[PDB]
Amino acid sequence: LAIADTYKVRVTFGQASLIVEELIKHNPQSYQILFNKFRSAISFKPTVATILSPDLLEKQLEDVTGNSLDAYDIEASHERSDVLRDLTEFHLGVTLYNAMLENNCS
């Protein structure tokens, strides 16, 4: 897949959401985002930012002597695997929106 002409007018969150959704057409266990983080006007350190898929792999890495996610009391309408699905897609849409804003001014 090739996304281009992103930075033509401006980069929005709704634009980064549709780029996120097509990464959810494929159904991986993880995502890797490679972008240049704008530390200063000189240094642009390339960042690896990663997002795990919710009940496929995100819940499995949290099973450290039980689970690290059970401290949180889920106030969703449905159960925890559906709130983690909405939360990973919201994590993917902001990590991608920040990626193409950090990289646009880098």
Binding site: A2, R10, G14, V20, E21
Partner: protein
């Protein structure tokens, strides 16, 4: 088929649902502020599937009033 909330059982993602609720909230501001929030409403990019390493079709996005509310 699916299990989840009312957007998830209709074939709509969370990002498509929660941008729609951000789409409709931008419209009901004051025009001093609605024209400011109009700037972040526009979606302009193009995606292209790349099947062979060389080619594919392409799909341009030009929506200025927000995310596609229609079924994609």
């Amino acid at each position: 088929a699916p299990s989840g909330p009312f957007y998830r059982v209709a074939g709509m993602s969370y990002l498509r649902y929660s941008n729609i609720c951000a789409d409709l909230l931008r419209n009901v501001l004051k025009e001093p502020f609605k024209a400011k929030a109009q700037a972040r409403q526009a979606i302009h990019f193009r995606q292209a599937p790349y099947v062979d390493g060389k080619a594919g079709a392409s799909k341009v996005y030009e929506l200025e009033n927000g995310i596609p509310k229609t079924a994609n």
